[PDB]
Write a protein that binds this ligand. Structure first.
Ligand SMILES: Nc1ncnc2c1ncn2[C@@H]1O[C@H](COP(=O)(O)O)[C@@H](O)[C@H]1O
Ligand SMILES: [Zn+2]
Lengths: 531, 157, 313, 77, 77
């Protein structure tokens, strides 16, 4: 081995986990294996897709359908069985990956594409004081970043939001970009095939069979036929389920009637160009590149819409009682549905047609990436990791990757690790204690009084569990949670390695509780704070 | 869910409990297990003195996504009510909680709730987000007033 | 376009970046590769994944026990076997519809006509005279010439495109430009004692100088650095560094004495990164879709930065 | 007004104008608005110096037409 | 104290006098005085940056007599 032995033995004796079996993940794992790392933990929730083969060199064509972690492990046994590899087919947000699950590792690097998972692993590692190496890949772009507790800024020092979801209110009435109608189609799919998420509801709810146009012309009917509430707003999902998802009825409801209903807003179209309603009858009876890169005719899009809704109705019939269908970027039926809807909306608002290829591009927010940049990012990650394990954190630096050399004739740019921001609330040196207790017998009453009120002088405790989603366990106002004070912590899902945040409305000082399960405490006591 | 969002929401809850407008309500929702999730809230907005909506106590749910406070919360009245600026699915829109116009991460729960209150007190025409309420309020004002009174008595405390 | 549906699906990600036409030109492309240090293996893998229809690689050495225990292409315990034949199975497994070729003959003995059927040639772990020969042949044949290597935290690449044409995105929709580059004998043997080169030197990376030291040491010692002979070889690199830089007319202190402790190794990270950038350059040149970087790029791993530079234009 | 140049990580050229006392806050917000990217996703670098939120042109002291580097710490890995 | 330099779409300039740390009162009273039009259907752009309903000049970074221009309403979408 060409590595220095002081570091070679450290990497061959320590344990490092890498999260996400992406192309970056697979290249990272290969680099770690070649470097001499002995124990490596790999976790991924997704399976190998056909389009996934473009970058994941560890995954072959025959490997589609299996878990990413299992296939990555099998591939690394193809050239180095000696490495200790642990594979997990799960998501990081699963609570069993507690602070103790990260504390076991000497180093950890993220290879994720979703911002939420990245923030979660950031928080978990800062809880476990295990150094992190941040990275991301996009096309010919890339970067790496060291994340160290109390030395460098954490990934949450500068809050970076997740993917653009758009307000919804703009797209539901007046789309003006292809992205607008695409997210409109996604929301409509969630509305009439997914769960009853009223936020995703984008098609209007009314007396659906009526072809509404200026109800003020029938003002007496609008209050004599039905009471206040517009016939109690028949749900679009319920209407579609009751009508058996009739392609013609659905098409006219969401492309002719609702368009006129929108056209009732003359105050909106006095500035914006008014859209046009399309009817199924006239569209049907009016009389090279990839297969997805060419725009089709509105009649062909309507035919695709009908076929897609038929297939999706069949798939829903495969489910029970109308179970929701989760959207995906690879399902042919749902994707044909969304492209048809988006192109129909574009033709509605006098906008140009967009091919299925572009809808696939910006619908699932597929970020392009090349194995070149993926490889360089993984190499930067492992170089920074060996620097970290060597203790040369001062020499560790944030490195970006460029498609074109900068005017400073540099392609990989080094930047000093900025000190952590003192007030981002996650990397601050907030006081913490760990208390061992028997989860299955201690109750919320004891937790609130004995463990917090008198043990830490909290006069108004509102302890809160930071499970990665956010919920308060108890409230300072007794009228909010006193009904569940007799429950156990195991009843609320606080397992070993969990942690809670406590606060006071008058002492205005926060305190963090770390949970360790300890049956050995006996009967005389139910808890103990570790000194 | 970002930890910054969690800490910020905890601070907002503390500030709201310490000081909030009279007979207003803003609490995290009762989870099925009995806890409250601070990322999704139940709120109820009372009417203003002399206004047609006076006396009613209109229930409103607001949704916080992982990008808060960079992203605004998505609010929604349950059940949906008869107002031009609310989508009859219940969700409401205003520049206060829309990214591209005025949404500032530094703003708090109290001021956005006051914004929704004054929006209810200010039915606008230049930004219609619904049809039926818009056309009634634009053409036949007396029926709109009668329906507003009916709603106010419908959501009375 | 004669692109099949499943082949497009396997390439679906990169089409969204550089378009169908670049992929079609790659399907019309053939590449010659030489040398299989971790760098050769990674560059072969990345070219395979890129979508070039045919990759031909050449090497003159077997798998030896002194080689590291992992090369991520050759199978476990493939010692004694030819490295090309030890790797071809996994290399083809990386992408089934791309065909690969394995050559055991040394490029020194290889005839000039053998390079004609390739649009790009890649060189690794070879003597500078043979680099000159292959580069001048490539320039004569109007073919794009690339080379590069890795040694510890230090790595380099070179690219000579000759008369080259390419397109770019109009980033303040494609627009056509062109670029011209010079052979290695013009680039590598640049006279630094000239006033303009001397002026540019003070803001010129020393990575080229340590590369020249390494190259010389490779040519005269007949083998690459190996950890079992660190001390005597290290002193040899130091003294030959003095010899070359004072002969070239530059102060040896510009290459600090500790550079040996960094270069005297072969590591996966620095190998993988330089190979990735080399593959980026190769695919940009073959597709003519992105503007190639200038003839030289270097990497200092301990310093954690990469520099593109112009030498001997 | 005193002129400066900002060249993007993707070789995108954008050209902006500023005063010596005008906080770079405005400059970076303007850039991310023009590019349509969330603010915290961009890193601004001058000759290797990270541009802080509390920075002002008389502090880093550039000359006119000087280049200020931007790099975008993108997700999607 | 602050000299206001508000000009509407009709090129109408109205003068006001407010303190340094005015936060919302400035824009609220300017709206209520010049309105002719509902408040929500109007906006002022200040050095090309759209203000918030509490954006004070001291934390904006403007000073006396700085020119502030309104912009066409974006309520239509
Ligand atoms: N929460 C998560 N848990 C495990 N793996 C994940 C998670 N989020 C993303 N990944 C993986 O991270 C990789 C990122 O995508 P890509 O790099 O494009 O392959 C994929 O392999 C995903 O399956
Ligand atoms: Zn922090």
């Amino acid at each position: 081995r060409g590595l220095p032995r002081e570091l070679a033995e450290a990497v061959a004796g320590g344990r490092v986990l890498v999260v996400g079996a992406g192309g970056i993940g697979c290249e990272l794992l290969k680099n770690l294996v070649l470097t001499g790392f002995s124990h490596i933990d790999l976790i991924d929730l997704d399976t190998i897709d056909v389009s996934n083969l473009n970058r994941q060199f560890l995954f072959q064509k025959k490997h589609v359908g299996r878990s990413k972690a299992q296939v990555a492990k099998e591939s690394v046994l193809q050239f180095y069985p000696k490495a200790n590899i642990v594979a997990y087919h799960d998501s990081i947000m699963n609570p069993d990956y507690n602070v103790e699950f990260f504390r076991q590792f000497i180093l950890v690097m993220n290879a994720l594409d979703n911002r939420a998972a990245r923030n979660h692993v950031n928080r978990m590692c800062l809880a476990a004081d295990v150094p992190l190496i941040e990275s991301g890949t996009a096309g010919y772009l890339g970067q790496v970043t060291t994340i160290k507790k109390g030395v460098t800024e954490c990934y949450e020092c500068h809050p970076k939001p997740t993917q653009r979801t758009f307000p919804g209110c703009t797209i539901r009435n007046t789309p003006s970009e292809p992205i607008h109608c695409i997210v409109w189609a996604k929301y409509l799919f969630n509305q009439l095939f997914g769960e009853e998420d009223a936020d995703q509801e984008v098609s209007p709810d009314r007396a659906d069979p009526e072809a509404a146009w200026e109800p003020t012309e029938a003002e007496a009917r609008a209050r004599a036929s039905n009471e206040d509430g517009d016939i109690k707003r028949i749900s679009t999902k319920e209407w579609a389920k009751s009508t058996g998802y009739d392609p013609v009825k659905l098409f006219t409801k969401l492309f002719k009637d609702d368009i006129r209903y929108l056209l009732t807003m003359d105050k909106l179209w006095r500035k914006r160009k008014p859209p046009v309603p399309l009817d199924w009858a006239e569209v049907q009876s009016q009389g090279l590149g990839l297969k997805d890169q060419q725009v089709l005719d509105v009649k062909s899009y309507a035919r695709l819409f009908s076929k897609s809704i038929e297939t999706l109705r069949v798939h829903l019939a495969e489910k029970g009682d109308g179970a929701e269908l989760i959207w995906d970027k690879d399902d042919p039926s749902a994707m044909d549905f969304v492209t048809s809807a988006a192109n129909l909306r574009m033709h509605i608002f006098s906008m140009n047609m967009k091919s299925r290829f572009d809808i696939k591009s910006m619908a699932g927010n597929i970020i392009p990436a090349i194995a070149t940049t993926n490889a360089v990012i993984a190499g930067l990650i492992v170089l920074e990791g060996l620097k970290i394990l060597s203790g040369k954190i001062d020499q560790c630096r944030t490195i970006f990757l460029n498609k074109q050399p900068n005017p400073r004739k540099k392609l990989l740019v080094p930047c000093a690790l900025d000190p952590p921001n003192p007030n981002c609330y996650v990397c601050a040196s907030k006081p913490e204690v760990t208390v061992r207790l028997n989860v299955h017998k201690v109750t919320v009453l004891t937790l609130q009084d004995k463990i917090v009120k008198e043990k830490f002088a909290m006069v108004a405790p509102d302890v809160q569990i930071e499970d990665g989603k956010g919920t308060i366990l108890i409230s300072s106002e007794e009228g909010e949670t006193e009904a569940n004070n007799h429950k156990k912590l195991s009843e609320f899902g606080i397992r070993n390695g969990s942690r809670l945040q406590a606060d006071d409305f008058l002492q205005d000082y926060t305190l963090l509780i770390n949970i360790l399960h300890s049956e050995d405490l006996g009967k005389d006591v139910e808890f103990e704070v570790v000194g | 869910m970002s930890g910054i969002a969690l800490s910020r929401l905890a601070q907002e809850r503390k500030a709201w409990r310490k000081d909030h407008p009279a007979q207003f309500s803003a609490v995290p929702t009762k989870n099925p297990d009995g806890t409250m999730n601070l990322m999704n809230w139940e709120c109820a907005i009372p009417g203003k003195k002399g206004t047609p909506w006076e006396g009613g106590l209109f229930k409103l749910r607001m949704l916080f996504k992982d990008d808060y406070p960079s992203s605004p919360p998505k609010c929604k009245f349950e059940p949906p009510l008869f107002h031009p600026n609310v989508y009859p699915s219940g969700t409401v829109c205003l520049s206060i909680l829309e990214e591209d116009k005025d949404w500032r991460p530094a703003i708090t729960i109290k001021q956005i709730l006051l914004g929704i209150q004054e929006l209810l007190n200010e039915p606008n025409i230049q930004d219609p987000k619904q049809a039926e309420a818009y056309t009634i309020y634009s053409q036949n004002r007396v029926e709109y007033e009668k329906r507003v009174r009916a709603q106010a008595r419908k959501f009375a405390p | 376009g004669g692109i099949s549906e499943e082949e497009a699906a396997q390439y679906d990600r990169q089409i969204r970046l550089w378009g169908l036409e670049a992929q079609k030109r790659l399907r019309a492309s053939r590449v010659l590769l030489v040398g299989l240090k971790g760098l050769g293996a990674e560059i072969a893998k990345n070219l395979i994944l890129a979508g070039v229809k045919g990759l031909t690689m050449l090497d003159h050495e077997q798998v030896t026990p002194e080689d590291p225990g992992a090369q991520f292409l050759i199978r476990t315990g493939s010692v004694g076997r030819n490295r090309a034949e030890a790797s071809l199975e996994r290399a083809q497994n990386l992408n089934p519809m791309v065909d690969v070729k394995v050559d055991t003959e040394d490029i020194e003995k290889k005839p000039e006509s053998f390079f004609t059927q390739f649009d790009a040639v890649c060189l690794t772990c070879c003597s500078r005279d043979v680099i000159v020969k292959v580069d001048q042949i490539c320039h004569k044949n109007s073919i794009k010439f690339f080379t590069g290597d890795v040694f510890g935290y230090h790595g380099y690449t070179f690219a000579n495109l000759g008369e080259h044409e390419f397109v770019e995105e109009k980033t303040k929709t494609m627009v056509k430009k062109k670029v011209v580059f010079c052979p290695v004998k013009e680039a590598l043997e640049v006279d630094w004692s000239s006033e303009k080169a001397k002026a540019a030197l003070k803001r010129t990376t020393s990575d080229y100088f340590l590369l020249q030291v390494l190259l010389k040491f490779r040519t005269d010692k007949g083998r690459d650095p190996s950890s079992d002979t660190y001390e005597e070889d290290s002193e040899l690199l130091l003294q030959i560094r003095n010899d070359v830089l004072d002969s070239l007319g530059i102060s040896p202190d510009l290459l600090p004495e500790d550079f040996v402790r960094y270069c005297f190794s072969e590591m996966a990270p620095v190998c993988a990164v330089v190979g990735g950038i080399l593959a980026q350059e190769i695919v940009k040149a073959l597709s003519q879709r992105d503007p190639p970087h200038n003839n030289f790029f270097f990497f200092d791993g301990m310093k954690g930065n990469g520099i593109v530079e112009c030498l001997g234009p | 007004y005193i002129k400066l140049k900002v060249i993007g990580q993707d070789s995108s050229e954008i050209h902006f104008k500023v005063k010596m006392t005008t906080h770079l806050k405005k400059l970076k917000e303007s850039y991310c608005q023009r590019q349509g990217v969330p603010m915290n996703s961009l890193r601004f670098l001058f000759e290797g110096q990270r541009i802080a939120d509390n920075h002002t042109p008389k502090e880093l002291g550039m000359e006119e037409e000087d280049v200020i580097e931007v790099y975008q710490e993108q997700t999607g890995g």
